[PDB]
């Protein structure tokens, strides 16, 4: 029994707890989810980027949720077809330059299946270590917050 409801809030929780977002971040993300095809599954293993690109953000952060049981999201390019997603990458990004930089990094994460593989059989600590390392080794994305409280193997 997993759906889209409360996944956005489950991943927003550590941001409001830490104070990286303004008030009900999750609702603003859901509004963008309602109007746009944020899924971009593009693969047998569904990928997603729920996000907001406005203000209501105190600083930039990446929050990665892991879903063991898929929940379909609208596909991009042709929106009528839903596709199941297992891995959800929530992005709280300001100033626009970082949204492109983050998508380019994410493209370098989804591509090369050896990383994408086994992602559903790793603990919160291993996922944190791998994402932290891949961000710190990026040529960009310095200053974006990532921590253990932003990784949920389930939900």
């Amino acid at each position, epitope marked *: 029994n997993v759906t889209q409801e409360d996944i956005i809030r489950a991943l927003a929780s550590p941001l409001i707890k830490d104070g990286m977002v303004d008030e009900d971040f999750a609702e603003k993300v859901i509004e963008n989810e309602s109007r*746009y095809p944020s899924g*971009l599954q*593009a693969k047998g293993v569904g990928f997603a*980027i729920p996000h907001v690109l406005g203000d209501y953000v105190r600083d930039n952060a990446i929050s990665v949720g892991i879903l063991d049981k898929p929940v379909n999201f609208s596909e*991009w*390019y*042709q929106s009528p077809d839903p596709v199941p997603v297992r891995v959800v990458f929530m992005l709280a990004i300001r100033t*626009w330059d970082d*949204i*492109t930089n983050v*998508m380019n990094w994410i493209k370098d994460v989804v591509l090369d299946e050896e990383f994408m593989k086994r992602l559903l059989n790793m603990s919160d600590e291993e996922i944190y270590r791998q994402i932290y390392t891949r961000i710190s080794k990026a040529p960009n994305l310095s200053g974006i917050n990532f921590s253990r409280e932003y990784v949920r193997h389930l939900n």
Partner: antibody
Amino acid sequence: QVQLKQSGPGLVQPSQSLSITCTVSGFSLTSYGVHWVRQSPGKGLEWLGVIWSGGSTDYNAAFISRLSISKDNSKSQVFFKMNSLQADDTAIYYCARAPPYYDFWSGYSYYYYYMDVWGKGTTVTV
Amino acid sequence: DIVMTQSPSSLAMSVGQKVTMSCKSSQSLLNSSNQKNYLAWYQQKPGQSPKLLVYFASTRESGVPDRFIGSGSGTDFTLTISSVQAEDLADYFCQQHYSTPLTFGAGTKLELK
């Protein structure tokens, strides 16, 4: 209810610059893009360099061999204005809206580079 | 720049039958699936409508119902919606998508007689 209205001079000889202002109402300049295209009776249509109107971000110059000097593409919160010093050709006048979102699998830029709703245009002569 | 060309210069039209047109370019296909193109409809006076076709699917707006989508390969094409009434407009201009210069091609137009 949602319109792009264009106004500017015509009968402009090479000694005077061309300046065209497109007033945008119903298509906020913090979300939607605005593109410009030239349509002469004798050559086909051509793309002019644009600034995305969802925020004055990353001016994409087009046709460097056709690029004018000091082409500012100034964007305000009320209207967008184009200028060109030479005004040595005709029919430079369509203003159009571009989709307000990201081209996730683009190979060069994350904007769609697609025109949706066109304005009425102007008449430009030399 | 990237070459853009149309096959017909103009087509005769009557109420009945279908009207066929095609468009070629250096390349419109993407490696991460999908294809990006668009064919524009121009009323002789305002000339305001590339909006009737987005990529290879009916547009976001009402557009015209049952618009036909042609080949999804290197060469693109389209047919009118079987027999149409329309009027003698430049119903299609083929444009490049997925390209910084966004070069435009010539129109086709319909001709009653």
